[PDB]
């Protein structure tokens, strides 16, 4: 916000005991707003980083077992556990979109995120755990 970011700089530059008092209440609050934000942002970012990675990893595995590969048991297992974690995440993403009501850009990342999430889940469910 380039607006406050200028009203403050003039309250601080002020010379009256009343502008200081305000710049303070402003700072006090801007600092609060910047705390809630970052926290929101990290929650989403971290979540998405996991999803993307877990997506890629499992995707890789599932594919190694497409005609030859994946130690059937010690590889066939990591997957099973990876998968479940993806399933376990659908919930988190959905609540994430639900809470991301102020930034369609992020919201969209969460949705892209979720498609990929569901896509791989419908590939472990398909080829692999589906055929046999």
């Amino acid at each position: 916000d380039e607006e406050k970011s200028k009203m403050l700089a003039r309250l601080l530059k002020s010379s009256h005991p009343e502008d200081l008092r305000a710049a303070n209440k402003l700072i006090k609050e801007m600092v609060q707003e910047d705390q809630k934000r970052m926290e929101k942002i990290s929650k989403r970012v971290n979540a998405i980083e996991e999803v993307n990675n877990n997506v890629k990893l499992l995707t890789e595995m599932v594919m190694s077992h497409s005609q030859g590969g994946a130690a059937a048991g010690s590889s066939e297992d990591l997957m099973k556990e990876l998968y479940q974690r993806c399933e376990r995440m659908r919930p988190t993403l959905f609540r994430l979109a639900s809470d991301t009501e102020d930034n369609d850009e992020a919201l969209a990342e969460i949705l892209q995120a979720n498609d990929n999430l569901t896509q791989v889940i419908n590939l472990y469910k398909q080829l692999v755990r589906g055929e046999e």
Side-chain angles (χ1 to χ4, degrees), residues 68-85:
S74 181
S75 170
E76 237 54 57
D77 204 43
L78 184 66
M79 288 197 261
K80 185 188 184 64
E81 275 297 292
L82 223 53
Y83 174 81
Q84 267 154 43
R85 186 74 202 319

Side-chain angles (χ1 to χ4, degrees), residues 57-85 123-132:
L57 184 42
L58 177 59
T59 301
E60 174 165 36
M61 269 175 259
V62 173
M63 295 306 274
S64 294
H65 185 46
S66 287
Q67 189 191 186
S74 181
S75 170
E76 237 54 57
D77 204 43
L78 184 66
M79 288 197 261
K80 185 188 184 64
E81 275 297 292
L82 223 53
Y83 174 81
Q84 267 154 43
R85 186 74 202 319
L123 182 54
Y124 174 76
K125 277 182 176 179
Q126 197 206 306
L127 276 176
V128 285
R129 267 279 284 271
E131 303 174 309
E132 269 58 294

